[PDB]
DNA sequence: GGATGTATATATCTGACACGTGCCTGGAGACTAGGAAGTAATCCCCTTGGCGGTTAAAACGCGGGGGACAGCGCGTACGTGCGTTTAAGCGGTTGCTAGAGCTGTCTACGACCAATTGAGCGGCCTCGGCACCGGGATTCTCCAGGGCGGC
């Protein structure tokens, strides 16, 4: 909502645990499908990637 | 029959015990002040048992070669023994000076106490420098028009 209809569609953050982080990702892969969500874990080289 | 080995007795040497004396240092008695024990409050660090995630260190295995160790030869340098020298060790001279010990006098220097104040510790405001954001100047990629060729 805060994308699509007010235009507010910079860059958000959200902060969860690791555990959860699947359930956030096929969350965000279901219900918002055209988003930009990224993922944001890994080693050295990947978040250089 | 003479001299030798051995036992008991007597005088002398020597470490130890007790007596005597000084003196000075430790003990007894009394008083006082402050060092430390105890109390309460506040705040921060440490303890024990857990969880989660990163990740680099620890562990394990394996191949290989460098190094530790053993053996052997050799030659030299150190041990050993003897003869010779020399200097250490002891005893001795001869004076003077340094130093410990003791006594005496005195004076400058440091302890001690009261009043003071200025250097040390904490916070606050500002500057030097580094960094974030807006505006101007410079260079690179691209879309369209003009001209030429083919059926």
Same mark, same amino acid.
């Given at each position: !909502?805060?994308?699509?209809? +007010?235009? *507010? $569609?910079? =860059?958000?953050?959200?902060?969860?645990?690791? @555990? /959860?982080? =699947?359930? !956030?990702?096929? /969350?965000?892969?279901? !219900?918002?499908?055209?988003?930009? &969500?990224? &993922?944001?874990?890994? $080693? *050295?080289? @990947? +978040?250089? /990637?």
């Amino acid at each position: !909502w805060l994308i699509f209809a +007010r235009r *507010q $569609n910079g =860059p958000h953050i959200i902060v969860v645990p690791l @555990s /959860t982080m =699947p359930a !956030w990702l096929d /969350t965000f892969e279901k !219900w918002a499908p055209d988003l930009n &969500c990224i &993922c944001y874990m890994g $080693n *050295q080289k @990947s +978040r250089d /990637t």
